[PDB]
Amino acid sequence: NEDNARFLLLAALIVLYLLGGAAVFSALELAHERQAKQRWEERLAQFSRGHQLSRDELRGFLRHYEEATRAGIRVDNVRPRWDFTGAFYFVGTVVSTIGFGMTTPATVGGKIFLIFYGLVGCPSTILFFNLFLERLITIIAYIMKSCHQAGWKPSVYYVMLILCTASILISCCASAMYTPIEGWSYFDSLYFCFVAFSTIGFGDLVSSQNAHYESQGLYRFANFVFILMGVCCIASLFNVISILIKQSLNWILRKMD
Amino acid sequence: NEDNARFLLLAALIVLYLLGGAAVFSALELAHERQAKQRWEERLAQFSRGHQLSRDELRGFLRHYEEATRAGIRVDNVRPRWDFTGAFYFVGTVVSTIGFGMTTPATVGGKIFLIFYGLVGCPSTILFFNLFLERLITIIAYIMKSCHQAGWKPSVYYVMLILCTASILISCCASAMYTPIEGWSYFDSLYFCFVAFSTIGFGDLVSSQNAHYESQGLYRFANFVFILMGVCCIASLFNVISILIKQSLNWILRKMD
Ligand SMILES: CCCCC/C=C\C/C=C\CCCCCCCC(=O)O
Ligand SMILES: CCCCC/C=C\C/C=C\CCCCCCCC(=O)O
Ligand SMILES: CCCCCCCCCCCC
Ligand SMILES: CCCCCCCCCCCC
Ligand SMILES: CCCCCCCCCC
Ligand SMILES: CCCCCCCCCC
Ligand SMILES: CCCCCCCCCC
Ligand SMILES: CCCCCCCCCC
Ligand SMILES: CCCCCCCC
């Protein structure tokens, strides 16, 4: 009966969390959304009057442009898809369950293969992350024992603190670049780092697609390394925080009698 | 030395997997991509020549258009963003690490709150999924024991088969509702179900975004229920497959000498 009670309590808490978060986000964003819509409407009306084009013609043109954008066309210069390195980027985003969405299959045959490829590849990456976490814990214990100089394994709290420090350091080091190389502000770089590392992958900000990219050989390698390390660290941090949340749920169950 | 060897072997296998997948995907998609780009360029040239406009003006118009798409401006009658229901949809996509990208924060203050909200909310959902898997295993064991009529825990193989059957049934039932209500084919519905349930979330196909949606009261509830169950089932299946892959790696290491 304890397991059922804990399951029910967690479900209720998550429901309340979702309701409160929705109310806060709506209050934060509604005015900006309305202002942006009004600005777009004014711009469309001004263009229409400017060149006397009909509304339906503009709607057809915009539908064609949406279809083109679905295939990779952008107003700025961007790297080609599916050559050999765009495919590598795509499969990397797929196996890590990031899913930026900048590149998606569009043919029958590429969607069946996508299903089978993901079905065979996501568990391997999950296992890799788990093995990385185990190795990190072992090496942390070894360093701690050597510094003090088996039963020297650190507590969960210290592991959480170390993971937080590592995540902050990796994010700041990655954000040191990404800023001057692609016209981004430091806060935007930190936001992109958090969105990519947590495997949410909104897709509003995606790195390393500007056609010519100066050196472009070392930059792609550095991007790959940074994303790999960040994803590993954030995955480990989330697992530790989940353990702590389960302990807190047990405590609140005990208190309620 | 066994753990280090296993880590190195898994890394090498993943690297080879990525290279092969990149080659196959490029071979599958390059021709389609090029043809789509040529079609877009022909359409743009025809529009420019027909209405005697200039390319720079069209580039400016297209730059203005994309900025609206980020506020959520579409060509076919989408539902409003950042209302209470839209905010609920957004937070639901956030806490599950799906990240469709159809709705993203645009103001300073909503991104700090986004970071803190995700940092506190993703581990809770991970814990919920783990508790669901434990409860499912317990109920499966109880059902099997009662049918035969503690020590009646099913093996990993049977759990994997049951999870596969459940995932297939849930996907086919969600597709049987998505296909008529949306303008989608059955295969497209199955592809969308796989992409959403695995928490990849490309964002090319997103459901329940068509403004007036007939009844629209039961439809949103059914969408919520279907996505929740599918995500739970696919998470459990991925964990079981990861365990099996680890066993296979152990066998590979033992055989090689
Ligand atoms: C040593 C391999 C370890 C296993 C790898 C596992 C998962 C891969 C994770 C993240 C990769 C994200 C895509 C980055 C590719 C950028 C390349 C480019 O900029 O073009
Ligand atoms: C009993 C619930 C507790 C567990 C909840 C955990 C995670 C939520 C997971 C997935 C929700 C995906 C978003 C679906 C919202 C659709 C609403 C709409 O169509 O407008
Ligand atoms: C230019 C770098 C991207 C092309 C593919 C590189 C894959 C190997 C990098 C990881 C080292 C094994
Ligand atoms: C249409 C429903 C949107 C608001 C979400 C709450 C109702 C559904 C889930 C409630 C489960 C307790
Ligand atoms: C590891 C520390 C070096 C990373 C920052 C380099 C700055 C790059 C832009 C000049
Ligand atoms: C101009 C910046 C190129 C990237 C340098 C970083 C390479 C070493 C990272 C480990
Ligand atoms: C078993 C419930 C799933 C089937 C729903 C069918 C809906 C048809 C849409 C018109
Ligand atoms: C006509 C739209 C049908 C939506 C309801 C589907 C069944 C609800 C139970 C999950
Ligand atoms: C009687 C046990 C509670 C079941 C309710 C369903 C929880 C989602």
Ligand SMILES: CCCCCCCC
């Ligand atoms: C353009 C370089 C192709 C990838 C090289 C792979 C070497 C291991």
Ligand SMILES: CCCCCCCC
């Ligand atoms: C004993 C080798 C462990 C390697 C850890 C490497 C972390 C980047």
Ligand SMILES: CCCCCCCC
């Ligand atoms: C074009 C330079 C390749 C950089 C990769 C370095 C190999 C470890």
Ligand SMILES: CCCCCCCC
């Ligand atoms: C002594 C083994 C080192 C392993 C390095 C692995 C790099 C990801």
Ligand SMILES: CCCCCCCC
């Ligand atoms: C706009 C009607 C939905 C309000 C949520 C009700 C939750 C019990």
Ligand SMILES: CCCCCCCC
């Ligand atoms: C009493 C055990 C609860 C399990 C219910 C699972 C609901 C899908």
Ligand SMILES: CCCCCCCC
């Ligand atoms: C507008 C009807 C709401 C249906 C959901 C209620 C289920 C408890």
Ligand SMILES: CCCCCC
């Ligand atoms: C957190 C209580 C509900 C907020 C208003 C819908």
Ligand SMILES: CCCCCC
């Ligand atoms: C599968 C080995 C790589 C061949 C294509 C570059």
Ligand SMILES: [K+]
């Ligand atoms: K994602």
Ligand SMILES: [K+]
């Ligand atoms: K996305």
Ligand SMILES: [K+]
């Ligand atoms: K994800």
Ligand SMILES: [K+]
């Ligand atoms: K995504």
